[PDB]
């Protein structure tokens, strides 16, 4: 995972999309502006983004169907989109409606996705028009060693068209609003579609464990005559020798299959310093005939939101079929509750298809699990002038800690990466309790002025003399760092001695390295993503956390709530420093500290404020006096509600951080 860096763009998009073409567009944008663009497709990126954006990192731009973005915007994780009317006129209005949340545009619409029925012409010159005739057809095809239909059953998105065919829906829309207390997952028609699916699996016309890979591999090799998929899937079929047609989904109970219409959208991370660059890229490069053509060449986008290129794409009969099915379905709601809904429906379908539940029990349960938490406010990013949060953590982008029994020399490796320009770094090596000599290998990404503190350590240095400049240089204990890739640097260093710790740090402001603190028993040091270095390494990153806040409506008086939520495995004391500036002589404020059960809080504040925490807390002035905490809500909205209970009209600070040792908050 590439961290955010000012002057560059990170982009997340699902692994089934045309990220190759999108990266091509990024190479164009880089050529023009000199801004590099890194496109990646992490697994479950839609569930990862909300957690990662709150820490300040994550992609500058996230690509996903609109249904999720509402959630993100409720948590204050997306910047407001303010395109010029001239640009707004270039895309269809309804695609803008998809990205409308509380009157604000939260993303850019890209494409319009809808599932279609893909069939093999050689196997099925005349594909059935109804679900009901599929079984009778699968008998005939199984006689020939084939199957009628195979599509992904592990995601409710693919099976929804049949559930919704009769009276099935997610959230009823009326009076210009979605009613979150009205859900149509457990109704009769949904039960009928899902019961017909369960009847297909029950008769061995489909395999309950079939997934995306199984269905794609099966259809591309001619094992099955039919599959259900979206535009993105046509490319891999083109490579295959299969002669395929793309047409309207079958009817169920005489009614057309209603797929959920998605709108591939690009949201701009509220933690991004490159917002203006992301708007430039999305508006003037990605959304053009050329850009959308480059992406669509890799993986078809379906119908694009951009009108000029849509007028060309509609000439594709496959896109025409996508539109035909989309016209019969329902654009997904974009509300924050959709996530929960999806989870529920998922576990329902699965459990109902595996036989663990009856359709009735599975769907009733779905209706109950879809219930979402109470929302107390819409969070909003807070600017630097209002508040700033800096912290020290033990977590690293990549890291490893290991023990070296009997080793006469131990090796520590640091892969340090910095943005453009000279950077300043403080590095301190802390001696272990007692003669073992140490090797420090530090490779740097740019020029760095370094304060190295190593006291009573028989230390050897390995670095680049041209990039690293010392405030206090040593004369003799130095080795010129060879220019290898990182893995080869690790092996080169291992040729001198075993590696006890290694870490890749992005734009570190300060670093502390503790010798002889090796945790557990691990003899080989292997880099793992998002590793917790424990006591071995503690560093202060330069990028600050994402601070958020809001106003709690219907709450009298002026009372500020400052919330810090530490994210999740042993007893840990988090130091929390609070500096409130321009605070009135008498200020009513509360500090809410939420974290796992194993976290104690050590509080130091320049102001006298209420204290509301989990676990236990102690003031920095009274180390050994322990005050037991309360049981606090786990969710962000839960904590906001706890703030409302405390008569807080204004949430001044809201921060979410992982595995933090020290946390300094500042608010004015
Ligand atoms: O199944 C739950 C899932 O449904 C939708 O995800 C789609 C997505 O819209 C398509 O672009 C493509 O990636 O297929 C996905 C299903 O595998 C929702 O957009 C998503 O929020 C939800 O998790
Ligand atoms: C530092 O590394 C990051 C990612 O590895 C890269 O984007 C950036 O350009 C590098 N800095 C320099 C000065 O090359």
């Amino acid at each position: 995972g590439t961290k955010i860096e000012e002057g560059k763009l990170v982009i997340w998009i699902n692994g089934d999309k045309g990220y190759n073409g999108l990266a091509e567009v990024g190479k164009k944008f880089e050529k023009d502006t000199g801004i590099k663009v890194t496109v990646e497709h992490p697994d479950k990126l839609e569930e990862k983004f909300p957690q990662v954006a709150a820490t300040g990192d994550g992609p500058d731009i996230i690509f996903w169907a609109h249904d999720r973005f509402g959630g993100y915007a409720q948590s204050g994780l997306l910047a407001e989109i303010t395109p010029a009317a001239a640009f707004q006129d270039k895309l269809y209005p309804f695609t803008w409606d998809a990205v409308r949340y509380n009157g604000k545009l939260i993303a850019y619409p890209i494409a319009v996705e809808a599932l279609s029925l893909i069939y093999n012409k050689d196997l099925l010159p005349n594909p059935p028009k109804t679900w009901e005739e599929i079984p009778a057809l699968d008998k005939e095809l199984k006689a020939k060693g084939k199957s009628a239909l195979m599509f992904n059953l592990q995601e409710p998105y693919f099976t929804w068209p049949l559930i919704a065919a009769d009276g099935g829906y997610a959230f009823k829309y009326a009076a210009g609003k979605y009613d979150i207390k009205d859900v149509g997952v457990d109704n009769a028609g949904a039960k009928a579609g899902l019961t017909f699916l369960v009847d297909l699996i029950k008769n061995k016309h489909m395999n309950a464990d079939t997934d995306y890979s199984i269905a794609e591999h099966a259809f591309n090799h001619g094992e099955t005559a039919m599959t259900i998929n979206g535009p993105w899937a046509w490319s891999n079929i083109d490579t295959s020798a299969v002669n395929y047609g793309v047409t309207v989904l079958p009817t169920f109970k005489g009614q057309p299959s209603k797929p959920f219409v998605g709108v591939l959208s690009a949201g701009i991370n509220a933690a991004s310093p490159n917002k203006e660059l992301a708007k430039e890229f999305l508006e003037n490069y990605l959304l053009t005939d050329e850009g959308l053509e480059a992406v669509n060449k890799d993986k078809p986008l379906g119908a694009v939101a951009l009108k000029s290129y849509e007028e060309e794409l509609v000439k594709d009969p496959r896109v025409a079929a996508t539109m035909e099915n989309a016209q019969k379905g329902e654009i997904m709601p974009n509300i924050p509750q959709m996530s929960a809904f999806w989870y529920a429906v998922r576990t329902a379908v699965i459990n109902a298809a595996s036989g663990r539940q009856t359709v009735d029990a599975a769907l009733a349960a779905a209706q109950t699990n879809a219930a979402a938490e109470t929302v107390h406010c819409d969070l909003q990013p807070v600017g630097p002038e209002r508040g700033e949060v800096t912290y020290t953590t033990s977590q690293v982008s990549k890291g490893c800690v290991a023990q070296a029994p009997n080793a006469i020399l131990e090796v520590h490796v640091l892969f340090l990466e910095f943005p453009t320009g000279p950077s300043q770094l403080e590095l301190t090596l802390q001696a272990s309790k007692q003669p073992r000599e140490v090797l420090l290998v530090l490779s740097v990404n740019s020029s760095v002025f370094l304060h190295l503190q190593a006291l009573g350590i028989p230390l050897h240095l390995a670095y680049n003399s041209s990039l690293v400049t010392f405030q206090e240089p040593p004369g003799v204990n130095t080795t010129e760092l060879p220019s290898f890739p990182k893995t080869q640097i690790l092996e080169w260093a291992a040729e001198r001695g075993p590696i006890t710790s290694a870490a890749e740090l992005n734009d570190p402001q300060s670093i502390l390295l503790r010798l002889g603190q090796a945790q557990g028993s691990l003899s080989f040091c292997m880099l793992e993503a998002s590793q917790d270095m424990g006591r071995t390494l503690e560093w202060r990153p330069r990028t600050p956390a994402l601070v958020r806040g809001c106003h709690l409506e219907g709450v009298a008086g002026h009372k500020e709530a400052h919330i810090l939520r530490v994210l999740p495995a042993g007893p840990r004391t988090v130091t929390v420093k609070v500096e409130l500036s321009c605070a009135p002589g008498d200020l009513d404020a509360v500090l809410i500290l939420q974290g796992p059960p194993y976290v104690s809080w050590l509080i130091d504040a320049n102001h006298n404020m209420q204290i509301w925490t989990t676990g236990e807390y102690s003031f920095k002035i009274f180390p050994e006096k322990n005050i037991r905490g309360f049981k606090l809500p786990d969710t962000p909205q839960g904590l906001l509600g706890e703030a409302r209970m405390l008569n807080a009209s204004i949430v001044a600070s809201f921060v979410e951080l992982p595995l933090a040792s020290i946390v300094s908050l500042h608010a004015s």
Side-chain angles (χ1 to χ4, degrees):
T2 304
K3 301 291 184 176
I4 299 180
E5 169 188 333
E6 186 177 353
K8 298 200 164 190
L9 276 72
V10 182
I11 295 179
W12 282 4
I13 185 168
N14 203 16
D16 55 348
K17 293 295 186 296
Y19 52 73
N20 294 279
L22 184 63
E24 201 176 2
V25 183
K27 297 173 183 181
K28 174 60 163 53
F29 179 76
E30 181 187 351
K31 284 186 173 180
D32 281 27
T33 70
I35 304 297
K36 190 191 170 184
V37 177
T38 306
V39 182
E40 302 172 354
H41 42 277
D43 192 350
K44 292 183 176 182
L45 64 85
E46 74 281 26
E47 297 172 351
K48 286 181 175 179
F49 173 78
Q51 305 162 347
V52 181
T55 79
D57 69 325
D60 289 273
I61 304 98
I62 171 166
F63 279 83
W64 197 268
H66 63 290
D67 60 320
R68 292 265 170 170
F69 287 68
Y72 306 155
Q74 183 190 246
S75 311
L77 308 173
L78 293 177
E80 188 183 21
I81 306 306
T82 56
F87 182 86
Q88 290 189 62
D89 288 26
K90 288 186 173 181
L91 294 80
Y92 290 106
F94 74 102
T95 65
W96 285 118
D97 295 343
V99 296
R100 260 185 185 83
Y101 171 85
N102 288 342
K104 290 183 180 178
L105 300 173
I106 60 176
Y108 285 97
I110 308 303
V112 176
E113 314 170 352
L115 294 173
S116 301
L117 182 73
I118 308 173
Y119 67 98
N120 190 329
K121 288 186 178 182
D122 296 332
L123 301 170
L124 255 173
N126 299 97
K129 291 286 192 176
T130 73
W131 282 92
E132 286 75 358
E133 65 191 285
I134 294 174
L137 182 63
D138 184 48
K139 295 182 181 181
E140 297 299 323
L141 294 171
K142 281 199 172 191
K144 296 185 173 182
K146 304 279 180 168
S147 70
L149 174 59
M150 286 188 63
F151 65 100
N152 183 14
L153 301 174
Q154 309 304 314
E155 282 292 350
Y157 178 78
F158 292 80
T159 183
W160 184 259
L162 180 59
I163 292 167
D166 200 333
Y169 64 89
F171 293 93
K172 186 172 182 179
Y173 189 85
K177 177 184 172 181
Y178 282 106
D179 180 9
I180 56 173
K181 298 179 181 180
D182 186 340
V183 186
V185 299
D186 80 318
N187 64 26
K191 281 170 171 181
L194 178 50
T195 296
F196 180 86
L197 177 65
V198 169
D199 292 330
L200 291 173
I201 299 174
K202 181 179 179 182
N203 301 326
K204 291 195 178 186
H205 300 308
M206 275 192 299
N207 196 9
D209 70 340
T210 296
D211 60 81
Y212 191 80
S213 302
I214 301 177
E216 181 174 46
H217 174 94
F219 188 73
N220 292 14
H221 300 76
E223 290 177 351
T224 189
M226 293 179 134
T227 183
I228 296 178
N229 222 326
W232 55 83
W234 302 337
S235 185
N236 286 8
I237 306 170
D238 291 343
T239 310
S240 185
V242 178
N243 178 23
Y244 69 107
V246 183
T247 181
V248 183
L249 295 161
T251 59
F252 177 70
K253 291 190 171 188
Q255 291 165 302
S257 309
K258 298 179 68 190
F260 262 134
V261 181
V263 180
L264 185 64
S265 306
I268 301 178
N269 189 336
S272 176
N274 309 312
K275 296 183 181 63
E276 301 303 319
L277 295 175
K279 296 171 178 182
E280 185 70 22
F281 170 92
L282 290 173
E283 283 188 28
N284 294 338
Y285 286 74
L286 179 57
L287 288 167
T288 55
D289 300 332
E290 296 83 0
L292 294 173
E293 179 178 64
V295 181
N296 200 81
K297 279 185 178 178
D298 179 25
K299 300 282 185 174
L301 298 165
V304 295
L306 179 62
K307 298 187 265 202
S308 67
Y309 191 63
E310 173 62 6
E311 288 163 10
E312 299 301 334
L313 273 171
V314 69
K315 294 169 185 176
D316 185 332
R318 309 173 301 179
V319 177
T322 306
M323 284 173 61
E324 196 73 6
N325 278 312
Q327 289 173 338
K328 297 176 167 294
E330 175 183 11
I331 300 175
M332 299 186 290
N334 72 325
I335 53 177
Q337 295 75 16
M338 282 296 291
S339 177
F341 162 87
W342 279 128
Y343 170 93
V345 181
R346 181 182 297 163
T347 60
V349 172
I350 295 174
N351 286 348
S354 61
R356 298 174 175 173
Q357 293 187 286
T358 67
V359 177
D360 289 87
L363 287 176
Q367 181 189 6
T368 306
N369 292 326
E373 56 177 1
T374 297
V375 184
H376 296 273
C377 79
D378 260 9
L379 287 177
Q380 299 199 355
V382 178
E385 72 291 354
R386 284 284 183 267
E388 290 186 339
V389 172
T390 184
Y391 64 94
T392 75
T393 178
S394 182
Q395 186 173 262
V396 295
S397 180
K398 296 176 178 181
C400 79
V401 171
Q403 295 170 351
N406 311 122
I408 58 169
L409 185 150
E410 61 190 27
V411 182
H412 299 245
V413 185
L414 287 172
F415 296 100
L416 308 182
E417 288 173 351
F418 304 94
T420 303
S423 312
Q424 305 178 29
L425 174 62
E426 305 174 5
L427 179 61
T428 305
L429 271 58
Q430 186 184 101
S432 65
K433 281 198 170 190
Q434 307 190 287
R436 179 190 289 188
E437 52 184 40
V438 184
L439 172 60
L440 176 62
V441 180
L442 67 94
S443 69
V444 287
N445 180 8
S446 86
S447 193
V448 61
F449 186 72
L450 181 57
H451 307 255
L452 176 61
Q453 187 75 331
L455 287 163
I457 299 175
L459 185 66
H460 300 276
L461 306 170
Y463 67 101
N464 189 4
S465 304
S466 306
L467 293 171
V468 186
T469 293
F470 286 96
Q471 180 218 351
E472 197 202 345
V476 172
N477 53 322
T478 62
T479 295
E480 197 65 20
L481 185 72
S483 65
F484 299 146
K486 297 174 183 178
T487 62
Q488 293 291 350
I489 292 291
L490 289 174
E491 302 279 37
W492 174 81
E495 289 189 34
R496 173 60 56 171
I499 298 177
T500 51
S501 64
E504 173 186 312
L505 311 183
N506 178 256
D507 204 357
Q509 187 179 358
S510 299
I511 302 168
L512 171 65
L513 194 65
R514 300 194 186 94
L515 299 175
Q517 302 292 342
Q519 304 286 38
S521 56
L522 211 63
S523 306
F524 290 95
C525 219
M526 285 311 298
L527 285 183
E528 295 285 33
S530 296
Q531 182 65 59
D532 176 14
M533 307 297 291
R535 284 272 300 176
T536 294
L537 188 152
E538 178 175 346
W539 66 295
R540 186 184 288 113
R542 218 172 281 276
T543 64
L546 179 58
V547 184
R548 292 162 283 168
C550 75
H551 299 85
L552 293 167
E553 306 176 10
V555 183
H558 308 280
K559 185 184 183 183
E560 303 179 357
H562 300 258
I563 303 176
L564 168 61
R565 171 167 180 260
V566 172
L567 304 174
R572 288 281 198 88
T573 302
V574 182
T575 303
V576 177
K577 298 175 181 178
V578 182
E579 203 72 13
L580 299 182
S581 308
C582 306
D586 286 90
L587 174 60
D588 190 16
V590 54
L591 182 63
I592 302 172
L593 306 178
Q594 196 276 352
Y598 52 80
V599 168
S600 309
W601 312 93
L602 183 64
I603 299 173
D604 166 38
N606 74 336
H607 182 269
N608 192 23
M609 52 201 299
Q610 189 174 26
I611 305 298
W612 219 253
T613 77
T614 58
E616 87 183 19
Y617 72 89
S618 169
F619 293 102
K620 190 190 179 185
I621 60 171
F622 303 134
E624 292 293 325
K625 191 193 176 188
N626 301 332
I627 297 164
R628 183 183 163 262
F630 312 114
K631 181 178 180 178
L632 269 45
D634 200 278
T635 67
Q637 293 297 324
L639 292 167
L640 294 168
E642 191 78 31
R644 186 182 282 280
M645 186 227 77
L646 292 166
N647 282 319
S649 66
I650 304 164
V651 180
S653 294
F654 188 93
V655 181
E656 293 174 299
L657 293 165
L659 307 174
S661 178
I662 305 171
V663 184
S664 186
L665 163 67
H666 177 257
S668 56

